Structure 1
Amino acid sequence: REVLQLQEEVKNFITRENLEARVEAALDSRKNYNWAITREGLVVR
């Protein structure tokens, strides 16, 4: 199950071909790993 859940992720590995798009794809896009927590164990963004 690692391998069949690895096969579909190989389709999104950055190749030498499919490269110049996904330099521009995420330089347009964004991700933030930023979140706090409260005095209860509940995460607010």
Structure 2
Amino acid sequence: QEVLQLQEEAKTFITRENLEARVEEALDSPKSYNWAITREGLVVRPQQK
């Protein structure tokens, strides 16, 4: 399973060709790692702003 999984993920890695495209791609798409918790044990996410 691990080898197959990595076999899949490898399609997506950054290479000498993808460099130009991928970089310009990532410069377009900001991501957040941010989220908060509630006293209940619940996750709260910011993107609803």
Specify if TM > 0.5. yes
Give the % identical residues.
87
4+ runs of 1 displaced by more than 2 Å? none
Following TM superposition, by how much is the alpha carbon of 1:18 offset from its aligned partner in structure 2, in angstroms?
1.3
Give the match's secondary structure for 2:21: helix
Q: Which residue of 2 is the match for residue 18 of structure 1? A: 18
Distance across 2 between alignment mates of 1:26 and 1:6: 22
TM-score (structure 2 length as normaliser) = 0.84
Counterpart for residue 29 of structure 1: 29
Q: How many residues align?
A: 45
Give the CA RMSD over aligned residues: 0.7
Q: Which has the higher helix share?
A: 2
In structure 2, distance between residues paired with 1:8 and 1:30: 24
Residue 11 (structure 2) pairs with residue 38 (structure 1)? no
| Structure 2 unmatched runs, 5+ | none
TM score, norm. by length of structure 1: 0.91
